[PDB]
Design a protein around this ligand. Structure first.
Ligand SMILES: Cc1cn([C@H]2C[C@H](OP(=O)(O)O)[C@@H](COP(=O)(O)O)O2)c(=O)[nH]c1=O
Ligand SMILES: [Ca+2]
Length: 129
């Protein structure tokens, strides 16, 4: 795939972020993960983790996969990178996201994310405790 520039507009929760992409506002939903909603257990913690990651990054990049680029809600379906670090893998590896929502086309980093999940699970992190 190929990484593309974007600028942060605002953090939203663990797996959604509003970015400026191609000069336009756009809500992005992280591919291949599911963070708790804010009102749920580890919701505030996943929200804060993502917010930290995007806000402290000098460089935000987005990466579409080979399947669908936008969801039914108009949300961009991407890997988000913060100074080269994938936010999707970061959450899973700390047990703040479960691997979930695996569609054909958009599963390039599925096995990468699953690896991080086992590791969080063995370490009994957050969600897995
Ligand atoms: C992650 C992801 C979610 N979705 C849709 C399906 C789910 O629909 P429903 O809202 O009808 O359940 C919803 C889950 O996102 P949230 O986890 O943000 O709610 O977003 C996709 O279509 N493709 C995707 O890659
Ligand atoms: Ca969610």
């Amino acid at each position: 795939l190929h990484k593309e520039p974007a600028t942060l507009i605002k953090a939203i929760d663990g797996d959604t972020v509003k970015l400026m992409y191609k000069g336009q506002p756009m809500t992005f939903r992280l591919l291949l993960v599911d963070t708790p909603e804010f009102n749920e257990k580890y919701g505030p913690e996943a929200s804060a983790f993502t917010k930290k990651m995007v806000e402290n990054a000098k460089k935000i990049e987005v990466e579409f996969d080979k399947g669908q680029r936008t969801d039914k809600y108009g949300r961009g379906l991407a890997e988000i990178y913060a100074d080269g670090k994938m936010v999707n893998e970061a959450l899973v590896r700390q047990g703040l996201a479960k691997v979930a929502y695996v569609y054909k086309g958009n599963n390039t980093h599925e096995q990468l994310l699953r690896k991080a999940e086992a590791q969080a699970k063995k370490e009994k992190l957050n969600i897995w405790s």
